[PDB]
Amino acid sequence: MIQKVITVNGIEQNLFVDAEALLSDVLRQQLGLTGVKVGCEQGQCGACSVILDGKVVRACVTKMKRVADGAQITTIEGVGQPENLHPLQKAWVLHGGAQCGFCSPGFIVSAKGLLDTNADPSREDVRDWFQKHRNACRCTGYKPLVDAVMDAAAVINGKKPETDLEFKMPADGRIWGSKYPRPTAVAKVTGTLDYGADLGLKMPAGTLHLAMVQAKVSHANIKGIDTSEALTMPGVHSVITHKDVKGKNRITGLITFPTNKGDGWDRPILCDEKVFQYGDCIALVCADSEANARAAAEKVKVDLEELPAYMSGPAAAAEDAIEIHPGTPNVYFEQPIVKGEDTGPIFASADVTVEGDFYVGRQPHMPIEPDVAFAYMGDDGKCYIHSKSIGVHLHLYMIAPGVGLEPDQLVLVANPMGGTFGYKFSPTSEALVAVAAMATGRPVHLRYNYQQQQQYTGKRSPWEMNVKFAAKKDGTLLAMESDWLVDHGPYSEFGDLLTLRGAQFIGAGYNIPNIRGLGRTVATNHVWGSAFRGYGAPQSMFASECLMDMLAEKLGMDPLELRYKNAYRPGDTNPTGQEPEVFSLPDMIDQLRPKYQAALEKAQKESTATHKKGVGISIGVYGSGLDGPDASEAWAELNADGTITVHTAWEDHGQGADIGCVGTAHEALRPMGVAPEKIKFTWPNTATTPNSGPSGGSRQQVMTGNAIRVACENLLKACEKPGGGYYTYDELKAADKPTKITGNWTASGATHCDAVTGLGKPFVVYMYGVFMAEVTVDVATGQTTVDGMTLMADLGSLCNQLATDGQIYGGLAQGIGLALSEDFEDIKKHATLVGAGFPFIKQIPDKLDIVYVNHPRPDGPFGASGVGELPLTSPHAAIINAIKSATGVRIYRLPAYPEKVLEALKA
Amino acid sequence: MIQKVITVNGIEQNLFVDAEALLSDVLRQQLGLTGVKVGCEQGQCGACSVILDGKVVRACVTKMKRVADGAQITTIEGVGQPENLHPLQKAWVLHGGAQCGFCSPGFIVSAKGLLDTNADPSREDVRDWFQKHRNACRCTGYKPLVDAVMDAAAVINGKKPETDLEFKMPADGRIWGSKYPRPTAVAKVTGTLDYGADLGLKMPAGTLHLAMVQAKVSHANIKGIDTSEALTMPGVHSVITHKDVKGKNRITGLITFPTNKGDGWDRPILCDEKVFQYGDCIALVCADSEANARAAAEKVKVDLEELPAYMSGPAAAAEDAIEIHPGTPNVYFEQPIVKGEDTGPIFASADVTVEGDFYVGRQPHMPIEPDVAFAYMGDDGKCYIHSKSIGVHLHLYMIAPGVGLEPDQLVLVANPMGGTFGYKFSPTSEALVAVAAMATGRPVHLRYNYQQQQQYTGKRSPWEMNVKFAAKKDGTLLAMESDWLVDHGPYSEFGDLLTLRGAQFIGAGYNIPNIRGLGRTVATNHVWGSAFRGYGAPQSMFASECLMDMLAEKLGMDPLELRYKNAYRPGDTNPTGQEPEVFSLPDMIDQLRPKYQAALEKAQKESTATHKKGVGISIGVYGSGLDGPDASEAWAELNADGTITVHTAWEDHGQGADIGCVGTAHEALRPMGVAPEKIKFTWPNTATTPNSGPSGGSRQQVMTGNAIRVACENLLKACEKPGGGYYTYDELKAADKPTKITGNWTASGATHCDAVTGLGKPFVVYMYGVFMAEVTVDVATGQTTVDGMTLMADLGSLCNQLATDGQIYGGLAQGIGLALSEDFEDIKKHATLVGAGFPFIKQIPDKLDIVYVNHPRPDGPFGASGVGELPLTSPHAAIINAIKSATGVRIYRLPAYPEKVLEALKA
């Protein structure tokens, strides 16, 4: 051990450390500076950036031996605090740079280091700095972050007053549609919002820390577990196995379709008889620390009989493949789509037909924060779980039978969380921590490392697709055929539903009167499927939007004009036979057209012999809602102090549940003149908030926003005075009148898609958009650079523009990754950010352009649709279409790795 | 477990707690708010004061079940931080209220609660508030704290500007003699100075926490130790016993006198053969937490054979008493005093003689911070100990042979510490933590609780005394006889030296030409003796100053005038035959006289039938130095940045080592124009600071102040330019000239007292003072209230008046405790602050008056003497003399408990 006397955030610290200890651990654990966020633990994400003697360093890869006596360290806590915010912090708030907020401390500290060395950076200097310092963000697409740095720099430089970093209320006092900052932003930019790992450090000494004993093969029969050596190791309390599970030891898929061949009870909590994928949790070590638990987990010996593993859909779907779940066929679900007339004769007589085989793979969500959860037995006898769940009520019912609790004896709560992008539509750690809390009686905390985040959370499910179009010479679509095979890994939850998305979204955007297709879901031993932002549309619309460009090419037609010819107009129906609710695609195309023509001309002018430029288009469509007559509930409560609490379970991945609640409620409460800062939101909790439903399907703004609107309307009625005006809280309580008022809303017009035909009215609101990608391909290397992305977006009406702009930039950035670099195919190689192709800032162009073309929705609150998934529906199709424009090469199977593009260029 | 969402220091906290957990633990451990200080753990000291929903509560006795959802908590961290100080914090700094600083957070938080309820308190309101909230201070005597509150209130009230709470540099730029604030004050008032328990919370996860397995009888032969059950308990690493000690397993007294009958090697590190007092450490449990170590220590079984214990000096000194240390007589040392002619014939022919039997007991130091230390093996192979040692070099040599290390393989460092008042002149925990670090190889931390602080740290040693005077009718002293028996408990360190103090200080102040006396030191089984501020003078001068009043009464003379007749004047010698160095007692008496006469008149006027007022006087004298030719060393270094570091081992109990260094160096550096904020001090460290010696014997200002002066003079010479002016650092390094310059100083005129006669010149500087106490006795109850204390003090020259005023107020307050309430006699009953008679604020009058009558010392730096022990030399004699004035009752045996006074009143 060594004494080191240094200065941390301006205060001398008399530190006692191991010279080998990591600075991140010292700062977080020894000094309580949980504003230093740790994600990857491998120097790749920047979340743990600190200033050490004027240099920005990653604390997770800086050992204390590198910190000299007398060193100066700055963490986010030393940059500024609430009510003493630094210009960078104020600018982050103003520009909406904290979505999940997990990266915000690191970017802000890194940015302070930049500005301390270069006071007046260009935007490119900012981008170069964040690239060099590895500052990674999965939510924002980086542009808002650069905007904030530039604004802060101008203030620090004396070029504008610091008061200009403070939001200015609009003339009219309307926050709906504005750039009002989100309530959580101050806590995020100051490092004072505690995420699950932070909470773990702040839990009491009795708390047990868990480590998973995981399968290191993809498929096996388990013969036994030997915990004997582990129990002798430092700090070990016990080891938990399936024998300690008090219920069924299975998670239920809950809404398994009747025509699914499986019962939906396939997924274990703790493996008993089999390993179904690499990473499956077989046991939990409970210890006094994460480090001691992990060391002991390495010593638990699992005796198993390895089985041949099926590592892709086609392999598992073979007629003679062995059933992974004995008694259920590996191909466990099929969804037909049968619209209009038989397609065979139409293809035979059509002027033009095209066909393609396409693939979209196992995209990894890659939030900067790896999965984390904790649980405890309450003094009320209930088991409480605090996790990254984005569907607390849903998950309660998915896990309760398996853990052995009645629903009223379990409570799920959503912690502040550092992004999910859908992986938290699935249970991950909740049942594990519940079982351990119940078995031990003690609080328990489980933190995944980044390799566990990659290997042992769910993934976008790969689809192998064949799609065909028949059309007239003038470009009018006549018919479509489709076939898709969904590799869902071993656990069925929502896999049938995902397969149904292909019936809904392959070919969406256009009038297609005649469709015949079939989706199939197959169990494999690769990673199980969890929703990933877009949930079936990125697969579906990659196929159809690429195929539209192939049709245009075969016709000799411009691909934007082919889309214009076919885009939904009054009278048309979508693939499930439903009329669109608004008709904004022609408007968006007409507004994009001159920008597209200008981009084509620029691409021609700026292309060189080696660097070929191209422009690509695609359309995106997705529902806002869960299928059928989805619903939500909110409670609007006048508090004694005159504030209003709007109680919901709107789960915040980081997208903005806080501001969505406040903005929607503000607009609904306008007759009573309620200031936005007087409106409070509630963190999701199954015991104390209503069942607003999950934050999936781009649904909360529509469903929960309508419920909030209704609840607030009902609170206004409850407050209205005879003669005009409104009663105060004191007046209402004196009259023994209610102050907490419910509202509900249901998408009553919607119907589930039919099991035989696929037809129905599954959503009452959709999101519509048109993408344009501008790219450069180096034809010597195959490397593609995305130089610009544009989204024409119809969101109906904006609740909050900082929120929606940020949603769109983040989705576009994920689309660049999906197109060019990302996958989870290689269990080890793809288990790091860099290994799996995470998009760092230079991969994302600074030119991300949005044009809102909003057509108010009949059923949306104040006309709003959702936004969350729209920007990932098909940006990757536009990008691949742009590579084709540039070079003549079509990549059919994502991602467009440089060697893959090269091979195609040279063929 | 329960979730509680509350606000702490203005920031929402999502807390996860046990409802039974203490708020102090939650705040310190879970949230890292080590500004919440914990001393007593029993609700008696206020150090842990926090504001909870507008009320000041003691966090150590507040369980989390009492903290509601939505509660608001404020700790010192929420009051203000460095560079954002609250008016209360600024006022504390300005008024010198942070001495050790351990109580400062709690007083400041408590004071904020006061001012939030009563914006314009009277001084009495302030005192009532601190009494009610149990805010305890052992350093300051409370008056500076009240001063600070009143000043802060005036600023908060708009009656004076906040800038007036900032120190104003004197016209001349001289900080010597000024009220310049001490360097450590900001850290203390903000809770950002880490004391040993704070450091323990900030040590890494590898750290083992220790608990002592202690004797629960006073005297025994040990037969065996059974650790088997303890080793099975949660979190236990090992148990350490004497078998793990690598050296002699004994502490050496190091300077044991040749005529001591014992070898000075009597004290074990870990008991092997015997228990010598209740509390002796027999084993150390090492565990993952203090709580788990303590729980397991309760299960270690010690097999012993209890022996009859000698619980007082007279009992142990009996001719037939059994030797506690077999082979050494219990009476192990005697010191004669033989000055002038035989006293028997002089007593026989004297006009007047008086005699008395007096007792001063086992005063407990009662710092607010209980003892704490830690140790580790460095990467350099040395063992490092960080403790409350106030003599790091001394303790290194006292413990090294016992722990089995050569001196260069051990390093002792003084942590910031919450007071000692002398108990840390002894080793307490240093050898224990070293043995555990060496045995385990791991960092180890040991925190005593308050009962262990009381039972198992050393004490003022009781003296049983008989003193006699012979005098002329005119009051001239002719002769003195003296006999004293010192109960030193079982461990000999410095017990012979303490006994020698009686030869030096019984009768000090007056010319006494003929003295015959004998002191004896006896081992007992009550608590071992450790220095307590005054070290022999409180005992000695209680006897002689009470006896002077008895002589005055027998002569019918005024007691101030009797002192005036006899006080040292040129030509006189002190008891050891040495001439005083200055002669300030007549001056001080002449300046006190009219105040004394006025106080007598007030006492007569304001007395009532039931409440009798009186006034008492005493003189105090003590040396500044260790006996003989004491010495110190300092290094003055010009740093590259133009600051100057003055390297010393001046150990800071809280008295002001920091400001003593800075002020002394500033004065010495004046020719070079060095600003005080450019002067740095060093925390004591045996490896990297010079052997300046211990902070005992009121010596550092004289010895180390002279060494600092010399070092700085030598640095000036090293910097002087040819032609005038001074070279800069850069100029010196360019010339390859030295920048770090040594200075030494020795008290060359001093000689050790003779073993046969007691005569010698033991100190070259003494401190001189005259006390006046004003008291009221309720003759129905025997309760005494001290209404005022005055000290006339000759300190030569003041280095810093905030420091010296505070020293005097604190010593006067300890004198009130010694006189009226304090003891450590009953092992259990006296093991709490309240049980042992700690003086809370109402016991200490607001009227504490100082008059400096400074006579520059020939050998002191800039004329200074020490101050530390002067105010405790005899205030308790003045108080008992005042009770006698009031009531006619003399209390001979301290303390003057109410029942004791009543019995005397009624006899």
Ligand code: PCD
């Ligand atoms: N018009 C409009 C719309 C919307 N908004 C906004 O925006 C947001 C969003 O919304 P939405 O769309 O409704 O959604 P939500 O439901 O809330 O959420 C969810 C989503 O969200 C997204 N985004 C995001 N972001 C972030 N940051 N992070 C994340 O993680 C995430 N995730 C993702 C996903 S995947 Mo799934 O689960 O697969 O199905 S679906 C999803 C919010 O804040 C709201 O309020 C506005 O403002 N306006």
Ligand code: PCD
């Ligand atoms: N003239 C003069 C003198 C002095 N000063 C200051 O005052 C202080 C003190 O000093 P001194 O006297 O020199 O002393 P020191 O050595 O430093 O110290 C020690 C002491 O100190 C005291 N005080 C105190 N305070 C407090 N707060 N706390 C404590 O704990 C204490 N302790 C106590 C004791 S006990 Mo022995 O150890 O028994 O012998 S001794 C003693 C310092 O700060 C200094 O600087 C000045 O200013 N001036």
Ligand SMILES: O=C(O)CCc1ccccc1
């Ligand atoms: O409706 C449910 O209960 C879950 C529906 C769902 C699950 C995963 C992605 C989209 C919709």
Ligand SMILES: O=C(O)CCc1ccccc1
């Ligand atoms: O001189 C030493 O080595 C210790 C001298 C001492 C010890 C305890 C109190 C006063 C002086």
Ligand code: FES
């Ligand atoms: S770079 Fe340190 S946690 Fe990712």
Ligand code: FES
């Ligand atoms: S805001 Fe950057 S990772 Fe979420």
Ligand code: FES
């Ligand atoms: S009153 Fe709480 S530590 Fe003393």
Ligand code: FES
């Ligand atoms: S300053 Fe109050 S206890 Fe030391």
Ligand SMILES: [Cl-]
């Ligand atoms: Cl391909």
Ligand SMILES: [Cl-]
């Ligand atoms: Cl490649």
Ligand SMILES: [Cl-]
């Ligand atoms: Cl008595």
Ligand SMILES: [Cl-]
């Ligand atoms: Cl009593």
Ligand SMILES: [Mg+2]
């Ligand atoms: Mg500022």
Ligand SMILES: [Mg+2]
């Ligand atoms: Mg038509």
Ligand SMILES: [Mg+2]
């Ligand atoms: Mg590959």
Ligand SMILES: [Mg+2]
């Ligand atoms: Mg190749």
